[PDB]
Structure 1
Amino acid sequence: MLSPADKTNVKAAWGKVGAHAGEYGAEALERMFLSFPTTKTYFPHFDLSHGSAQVKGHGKKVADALTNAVAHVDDMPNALSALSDLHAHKLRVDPVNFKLLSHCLLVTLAAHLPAEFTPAVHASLDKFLASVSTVLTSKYRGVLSPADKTNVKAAWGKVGAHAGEYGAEALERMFLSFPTTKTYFPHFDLSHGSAQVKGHGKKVADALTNAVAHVDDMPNALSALSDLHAHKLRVDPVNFKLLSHCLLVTLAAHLPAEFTPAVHASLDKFLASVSTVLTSKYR
């Protein structure tokens, strides 16, 4: 994700933060608890009142972790490894919450760095925080294991020649369940039975068949598709989770025997991987 320009921007901005990192971290936390109260569910053992030693203390730990991340921006996975382990295995904070704290850190930096917070730096810090979030969340379920890859191949195998018909059904399910996704297809006839949907469904299905075949080399297998969605179609990233959900529902509706809990978990991880890949070039 991060380019060198991005790294220079982050380094610059965070440098300016300097001795205030701890104070900014506490403010970001306070801003999060107030703007997004559901985040307090993770801190029922804290005194969350303004200025508590607990919030100040925690704020300093969070900022020291981001400082560590900035200092090892080219090697984030390793620098933050103990932290990703703690969050994935002990704390188990739902991943949606990281975007919330990232937004609040961004608002905090904006309020304190009037000279430094230009549009380019804003974009870099946003990408930086999204990368830190991704690293802290990577071990929740992890990358695809051999059992996962085996489960996906077995389930996709049973799909076989029905792949295109299932892709079309998945799109239909998506359009009906998540109406906003229709905004990307104003040129299509979306009625049930539509040949355009059927044809497109076949294309999505073939891309996935291709991804299953290249499960260990997905970024290259999907490279042209990533370019296409990122720069030409420019589909907002949130929509990929909606089509993934609909594909899972289609698979469940058609694989009574193979959609076991373990296979369900492997397929969900697989679809989230395809989604990450399809959106990696957006920024």
Structure 2
Amino acid sequence: VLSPADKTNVKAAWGKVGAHAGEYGAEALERMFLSFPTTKTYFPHFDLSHGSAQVKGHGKKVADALTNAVAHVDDMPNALSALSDLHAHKLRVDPVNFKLLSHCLLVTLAAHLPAEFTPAVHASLDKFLASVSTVLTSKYR
């Protein structure tokens, strides 16, 4: 559960991502695939080499989805219903993988936004990603 201050921290921090969406999303994915090879099992059809166009395009979609979630932080289940169906009913993604990607997203943000990645912001972003993860791994209709 996000506190009112958590939501403000997330909006302020993610707003800094801006045009770096695809870039950061792509980096988080590469970090995940390299650090945790098992996660690759979900993308056997992907060219996962460094600089991969498929990874770049996919990273932008992941990042844009997070931007949408931030814009609907008060009603994420409704805003992410289609993505939940995809990850929970269709793909059946093991929840552990969301913890890994969330961690890689945090590492990416810390590496690009040192001034902004304060302990408080770090905590809020972790809770935010955990909540997004719960929604995407839940089947609620």
Higher RCO structure (Cα 8 Å, ≥6 apart): 2
Asked if 1:250 corresponds to 2:111, the answer is no
Counterpart residue number, 1:186? 44
**1:163/1:206 contact within 8 Å kept:** yes
Distance 1:232 1:221 in 2: 18
Partner deviation per Cα, 1:168-203 (whole Å, 9 max, x = no partner) = 000000000000000011100000000000011011
Gap change, CA 1:282 and 1:242, over 3 Å in 2: farther
**1:155/1:263 contact within 8 Å kept:** yes
Q: What CA RMSD, in Å, does the superposition of the two structures yield over aligned residues?
A: 1.3
Question: Shift of residue 232 of structure 1?
Answer: 1.3
Secondary structure, counterpart of 1:193 in structure 2 = coil
Gap change, CA 1:192 and 1:169, over 3 Å in 2: same
Partner deviation per Cα, 1:5-38 (whole Å, 9 max, x = no partner) = xxxxxxxxxxxxxxxxxxxxxxxxxxxxxxxxxx
TM-score by length of 2: 0.97
**1:231/1:282 contact within 8 Å kept:** no
Question: Shift of residue 282 of structure 1?
Answer: 8.3
Runs of 4+ with deviation above 6 angstroms = none
Question: Shift of residue 153 of structure 1?
Answer: 0.5
Distance 2:98 2:140 in 1: 13
Secondary structure, counterpart of 2:139 in structure 1 = coil
Secondary structure, counterpart of 1:219 in structure 2 = helix
TM-score by length of 1: 0.49
Counterpart residue number, 1:263? 121
Distance 1:254 1:262 in 2: 17
Match for residue 164 of structure 1 among 18, 22, 39: 22
Counterpart residue number, 1:276? 134
Partner deviation per Cα, 1:221-255 (whole Å, 9 max, x = no partner) = 11000001112111111101000000000010111
Question: Shift of residue 148 of structure 1?
Answer: 0.5
Gap change, CA 1:169 and 1:282, over 3 Å in 2: farther
Partner deviation per Cα, 1:95-120 (whole Å, 9 max, x = no partner) = xxxxxxxxxxxxxxxxxxxxxxxxxx
Residues matched between the structures, number: 141
Asked if 1:146 corresponds to 2:4, the answer is yes
Distance 1:173 1:191 in 2: 12
Q: Unpaired segments of 5 or more residues in structure 1?
A: 1-142
Distance 1:163 1:190 in 2: 19
The answer to which of 232-241 and 202-211 deviates more is 232-241
Distance 1:231 1:281 in 2: 7
Structure with greater Cα Rg: 1
**1:230/1:282 contact within 8 Å kept:** no
Partner deviation per Cα, 1:60-84 (whole Å, 9 max, x = no partner) = xxxxxxxxxxxxxxxxxxxxxxxxx
Gap change, CA 1:196 and 1:251, over 3 Å in 2: same
Secondary structure, counterpart of 1:281 in structure 2 = coil
Q: Unpaired segments of 5 or more residues in structure 2?
A: none
